[PDB]
Design a protein around this ligand. Structure first.
Ligand SMILES: NC(=O)c1ccc[n+]([C@@H]2O[C@H](COP(=O)([O-])OP(=O)(O)OC[C@H]3O[C@@H](n4cnc5c(N)ncnc54)[C@H](OP(=O)(O)O)[C@@H]3O)[C@@H](O)[C@H]2O)c1
Ligand SMILES: Nc1nc(=O)c2nc(CNc3ccc(C(=O)N[C@@H](CCC(=O)O)C(=O)O)cc3)cnc2[nH]1
Length: 160
């Protein structure tokens, strides 16, 4: 049907550090929940470990080459099996991390991207996507506030 990627990117497309999120942005985690609730979410094993528990109200599908270690989620061994395990849904949400985003970007018709105005040390990056292939269909900028220590911009891109 449709595969979408959702991610939050700091400067230089940094998305992770030492298997952790290198910022605290509750408005963006709220945006993540709004856009993934009641959809299947595909993630790599490292990201499963960084989240630390099943995302409620979502079918959690974990890519790993090795046997599953938690029966509260669905474990799959390949990209194609991950997609199949989602069932017939209107939209599959791929939620990272870097290695999984790389594999699903060529398959994706939509990107939900938060651009965070934060300079951050990172060992993991969102894939380097060709801008000519993508049209911005939504953009919403927000200044920092008492709850969110960085300004940030919500964007949705659709593949041209
Ligand atoms: N800010 C964001 O938007 C965002 C989103 C997600 C994660 N992150 C950050 O990203 C970092 C983790 O990303 P990552 O790139 O290190 O790891 P990852 O992509 O989350 O997971 C990588 C692992 O998933 C499994 N995997 C991936 N593709 C597979 C395939 N085709 N077949 C079988 N197994 C497959 C392997 O597990 P085995 O080694 O078990 O085979 C691989 O080691 C963390 O720092 C996390 O905080 C940030
Ligand atoms: N836009 C975006 N921001 C992120 O922080 C993000 N993070 C991941 C991977 N990491 C995480 C880490 C924590 C939670 C999490 O705890 N979310 C809960 C709480 C929502 C909230 O705090 O508002 C959830 O129910 O979704 C989700 C993904 C994947 N895509 C993303 N996409």
């Amino acid at each position: 049907h449709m595969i979408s990627l959702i991610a939050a990117l700091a400067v230089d497309r940094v998305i992770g550090m030492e298997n952790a999120m290198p910022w605290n942005l509750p408005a963006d985690l709220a945006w993540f929940k709004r856009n993934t609730l009641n959809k299947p979410v595909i993630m790599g094993r490292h990201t499963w470990e960084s989240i630390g528990r099943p995302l409620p109200g979502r079918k959690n599908i974990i890519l790993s080459s090795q046997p599953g270690t938690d029966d509260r989620v669905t474990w799959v061994k390949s990209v194609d099996e991950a997609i199949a395990a989602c069932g017939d849904v209107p939209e599959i949400m791929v939620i990272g991390g870097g290695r999984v985003y790389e594999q699903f970007l060529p398959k994706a018709q939509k990107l939900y991207l938060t651009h965070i105005d934060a300079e951050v040390e990172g060992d993991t990056h969102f894939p380097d996507y060709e801008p000519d292939d993508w049209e911005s269909v939504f953009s919403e900028f927000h200044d920092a506030d008492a709850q969110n220590s960085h300004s940030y911009c919500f964007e949705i891109l659709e593949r041209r």
